């Protein structure tokens, strides 16, 4: 009934809030930090890769009310490519930032050699390129096959017809949710287990609650990663085994499922650039 025009406001509120936050973060990086250290390079990377995917969000909104993809073929390939490109870029920037913090804490001697502001930009270009190397096999098969009546936006496969696209969901699951969770929970847990054995943070109650603050921030980033990208991967796996009965209460929760898939992109400004000390200067 009247949910099809009301869901768009609460579904593009994620677009508005995340776009405002990511533009705020990339603006304060480009206007107050000048990309001088290694950390602001990764923060600007995550802000840009979240901003582009967040600006993409209204394009998926018309695919419920209008029913179609009313953008023609001149946008379907491009939008699918930048969606499946900036998703992997926002994942791999978090992975590279986690590996950077793990090297900076757990291996302090080698961290002076590695994380110079030249190598941080080099591994940044490396993970953008590695995201392209799996986003372009998405892009070359991002066709447009018309329905009963609409214009659509979907991905058919090569030969074989129905399996070689079925590899893509499993690949995005095992290479975009299993590997980043399995890297940023261990890559941060060994950092926490190292910081509990640091004389700078062990005793001395004020410094003990500073250690508590660091562990709260690490649990917040890992828990918001899992809480955001649990349903959009669990549902896309369950949509492959069983054909879900088309209950009219499903699809509002599935656009909400896409919305909390992009809530990580929305809240990485609130997660990183607000909850540091670089915002104070």
């Amino acid at each position: 009934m009247v949910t099809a025009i009301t869901i768009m406001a609460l579904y593009s509120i994620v677009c508005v809030v995340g776009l405002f936050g990511n533009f705020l973060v990339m603006y304060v990086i480009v206007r107050y930090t000048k990309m001088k250290t290694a950390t602001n390079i990764y923060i600007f990377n995550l802000a840009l890769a979240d901003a582009l995917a967040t600006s993409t969000l209204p394009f998926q909104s018309v695919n419920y009310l209008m029913g179609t993809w009313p953008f023609g073929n001149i946008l379907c390939k491009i939008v699918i490519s930048i969606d499946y490109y900036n998703m992997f870029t926002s994942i791999f920037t978090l992975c590279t930032m986690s590996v950077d913090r793990y090297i900076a804490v757990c291996h302090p001697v080698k961290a002076l050699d590695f994380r110079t502001p030249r190598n941080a930009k080099i591994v940044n270009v490396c993970n953008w390129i590695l995201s392209s190397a799996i986003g372009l096999p998405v892009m070359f098969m991002a066709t447009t096959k018309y329905r009963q009546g609409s214009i659509d936006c979907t991905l058919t496969f090569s030969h074989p017809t129905w399996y070689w696209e079925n590899l893509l969901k499993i690949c995005v699951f095992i290479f975009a949710f299993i590997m980043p969770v399995l890297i940023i929970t261990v890559c941060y847990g060994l950092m926490i287990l190292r910081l509990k054995s640091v004389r700078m943070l062990s005793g001395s109650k004020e410094k003990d609650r500073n250690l508590r603050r660091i562990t709260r921030m690490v649990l917040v980033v890992v828990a918001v990663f899992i809480v955001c990208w649990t349903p959009i991967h669990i549902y896309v796996i369950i949509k492959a085994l069983i054909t879900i009965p088309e209950t009219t209460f499903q699809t509002v929760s599935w656009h909400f499922c896409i919305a909390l898939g992009y809530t990580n992109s929305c809240l990485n400004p609130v997660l990183y650039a607000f909850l540091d000390e670089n915002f104070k200067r």
Partner: peptide
């Protein structure tokens, strides 16, 4: 993700 398909 999720959308398109």
């Amino acid at each position: 993700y999720x959308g398109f398909x």
